[PDB]
Write a protein that binds this DNA or RNA. Structure first.
Ligand SMILES: Nc1ccn([C@H]2C[C@H](O)[C@@H](COP(=O)(O)OP(=O)(O)OP(=O)(O)O)O2)c(=O)n1
Ligand SMILES: [Mg+2]
Ligand SMILES: [Mg+2]
Ligand SMILES: [Mg+2]
Length: 341
DNA sequence: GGGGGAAGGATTC
DNA sequence: CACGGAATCCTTCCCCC
């Protein structure tokens, strides 16, 4: 089995550049302003100029300014990015039937039937980097290997604007080398729980008793990491289907007042329901981020579909439930719809 | 024991 | 003492078959 993984480069940032060549050469930071304050918000991404100096995705727009007070800061125009993304996803579909759009800027293609060996898979990759480069002028990184996980890992190692094949031999060596924290699905807390067990490489996972891994990091991550180390990880490439659709917004000020909060709640329902398109949901969840970025929610699943009107009513009861059971104020409020008919 | 719900938890884009 | 907006899969506790 051969998997080809593609991941666009500093995507949102690169897109703004392709739409305005003047930005090229200058550090760029794409951010999402909460509207709270003139510079309240987080960073979606920054190009590699700004990246060099610590400006990474997720940090406050304010932290970024201290560092690069003179970088170019642009508001995120997501509809534009989705547009560019779909056009590139369409070009990829041409190279293989089995394709999985994993996110706004990445995809896994099973090219087992389109190539005979790793050398051929490689040129397919170069063929793909060029197409996108001449059709959209967006550079991307490609990683190639035997399964989805190693295909991703490969692309991270080749970024930016690269291509990298990790063959069966190269895989065995990666199971031995490679910091376990670099494995997809392993974040900071999980990485720490593994350090307390003396686990630094995937291979080390074979040495611990299964129930000691299961007890420490849950059974899922256990099995996942185990088969990975045993070179038995084989998950099919499948087309993904949305399980949920939502919308959350930051209020102008924190609050615990129902009448002050309803308008924000209703806007979020209005916009979520438009995103649903044909879909009719059977479950609804009101989600809130407390004043201390803590997130809480209350939802309800119905015997049948939920019309927009019903969501307005139910959402208010659910919000009142949050207010009743939680004493702190709310900073962000919104909804999530799921269990589509 | 395990399916479906309901709140959290962790990770990732 | 800051601090965005989405999505997804998983784990713990509860009802119920
Ligand atoms: N915390 C994040 C991370 C990503 N994104 C969006 C904008 C990013 O441009 C896009 C792709 O995210 P990646 O980090 O996976 O890819 P990048 O292009 O940002 O970095 P790279 O150079 O690895 O491709 O997803 C976001 O909104 N918030
Ligand atoms: Mg990516
Ligand atoms: Mg990218
Ligand atoms: Mg919490």
């Amino acid at each position: 089995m051969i998997v080809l993984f593609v991941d666009f480069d500093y995507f949102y940032a690169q897109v703004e550049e392709v739409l305005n060549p003047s930005l090229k050469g200058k550090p760029v930071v794409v951010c999402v302003f909460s509207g709270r304050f003139e510079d309240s918000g987080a960073v979606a991404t920054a190009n590699y100029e700004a990246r060099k100096f610590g400006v990474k995705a997720g940090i406050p727009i304010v932290e970024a300014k201290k560092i690069l007070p003179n970088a170019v800061y642009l508001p995120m125009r997501k509809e534009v990015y989705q547009q560019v993304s779909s056009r590139i996803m369409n070009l990829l579909r041409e190279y293989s039937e089995k394709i999985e759009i994993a996110s706004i800027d990445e995809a896994y293609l099973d090219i087992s039937d389109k190539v005979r060996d790793y050398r051929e898979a490689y040129n397919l990759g170069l063929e793909i980097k060029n197409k996108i480069l001449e059709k959209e002028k967006i550079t991307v990184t490609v990683g190639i290997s035997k399964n989805k996980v190693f295909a991703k890992i490969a692309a991270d190692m080749a970024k930016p604007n690269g291509i990298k094949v990790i063959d069966d031999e190269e895989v065995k060596r990666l199971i031995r080398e490679l910091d376990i924290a670099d494995v997809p699905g392993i974040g900071n807390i999980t990485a720490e729980k593994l350090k307390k067990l003396g686990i630094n490489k995937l291979v080390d996972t074979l040495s611990i008793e299964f129930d000691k891994l299961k007890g420490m990091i849950g059974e899922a991550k256990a099995k996942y990491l185990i088969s990975l180390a045993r070179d038995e990880y084989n998950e099919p490439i499948r087309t993904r289907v949305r399980k949920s659709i939502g919308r959350i917004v930051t209020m102008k000020r924190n609050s615990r007042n129902l009448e002050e909060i309803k308008p924000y709640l209703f806007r979020a329902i209005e916009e979520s329901y438009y995103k649903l398109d044909k879909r009719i949901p059977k479950a609804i969840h009101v989600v809130a981020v407390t004043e201390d970025l803590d997130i809480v929610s209350r939802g309800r699943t119905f015997p049948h579909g939920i019309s927009k009107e019903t969501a307005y009513s139910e959402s208010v009861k659910l919000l009142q439930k949050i207010l009743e059971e939680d004493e702190r104020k709310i900073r962000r409020i919104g909804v999530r719809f799921s269990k589509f008919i």
